[PDB]
Amino acid sequence: LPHDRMTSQEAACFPDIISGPQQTQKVFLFIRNRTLQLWLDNPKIQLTFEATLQQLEAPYNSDTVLVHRVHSYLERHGLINFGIY
Amino acid sequence: LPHDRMTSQEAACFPDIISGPQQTQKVFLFIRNRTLQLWLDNPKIQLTFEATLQQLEAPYNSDTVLVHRVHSYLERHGLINFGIY
Numbered sequence: 001l002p003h004d005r006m007t008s009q010e011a012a013c014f015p016d017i018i019s020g021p022q023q024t025q026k027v028f029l030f031i032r033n034r035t036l037q038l039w040l041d042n043p044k045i046q047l048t049f050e051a052t053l054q055q056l057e058a059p060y061n062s063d064t065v066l067v068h069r070v071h072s073y074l075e076r077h078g079l080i081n082f083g084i085y
Numbered sequence: 086l087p088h089d090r091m092t093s094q095e096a097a098c099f100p101d102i103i104s105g106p107q108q109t110q111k112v113f114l115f116i117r118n119r120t121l122q123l124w125l126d127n128p129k130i131q132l133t134f135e136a137t138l139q140q141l142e143a144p145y146n147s148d149t150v151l152v153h154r155v156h157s158y159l160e161r162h163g164l165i166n167f168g169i170y
Contacts, residue, residue, distance in 0.1 A: 023148055024108065030144070059115070059144075063108055 003033055013073050031060055031070045039080040046084045088118055098158050116145055116155045124165040131169045 001007060006025060010032075011018045017028050038055055039047045049071045053061055060067070074080045086092060091110060095117075096103045102113050123140055124132045134156045138146055145152070159165045 021109070023112070024106070026144060026147065027108070059111060062111065 004029065009077065010073070014069070027060065027063070027066070028070065031056065031067055032074070034060070035070060035074055036079060039074075043082075047080050089114065094162065095158070099154070112145065112148070112151070113155065116141065116152055117159070119145070120155060120159055121164060124159075128167075132165050 006014065006018050006028065010028075014028060017024055034056060035047070035052050038052060049068055052071050053064060053067050056067065071080075091099065091103050091113065095113075099113060102109055119141060120132070120137050123137060134153055137156050138149060138152050141152065156165075
């Protein structure tokens with residue numbers, strides 16, 4: 001996926017962000033990008049929401065609702081935690 | 086000034102930010118707070134816009150228009166660069 005652009009699938013789950021200011025799109029992208037990096041560095045164990053929040057730096061760790069949405073989107077779509085129950 | 090709240094004077098110059106989402110208010114506050122810290126650690130030399138941008142970390146250094154507005158507001162109101170021509 002491109003690091004610097006939201007996809008069609010993301011638009012469906014984040015219409016508030018894709019329709020909104022560029023700044024907030026960049027926050028979304030940072031959270032998505034970092035979450036995927038954390039998963040791909042260790043893809044044999046479950047990457048949890050709580051663990052993702054603890055491994056994100058300020059200010060990305062401050063909108064906990066946004067981080068939970070990104071995590072949930074990634075897990076439900078299979079981009080993280082594939083094959084982990 | 087409070088680190089975690091915008092003032093009446095700031096509201097007059099940043100009506101778009103004070104009326105908008107909490108996330109973006111927190112970005113404004115971080116830029117304002119850090120700019121003041123940089124000035125107060127060395128209050129005998131001019132703190133320029135360019136120098137402020139170079140001493141800010143990502144992602145605060147990415148909305149260069151917002152950083153210039155905060156710098157200009159602080160200098161015109163006398164909170165930084167007092168007595169420097």
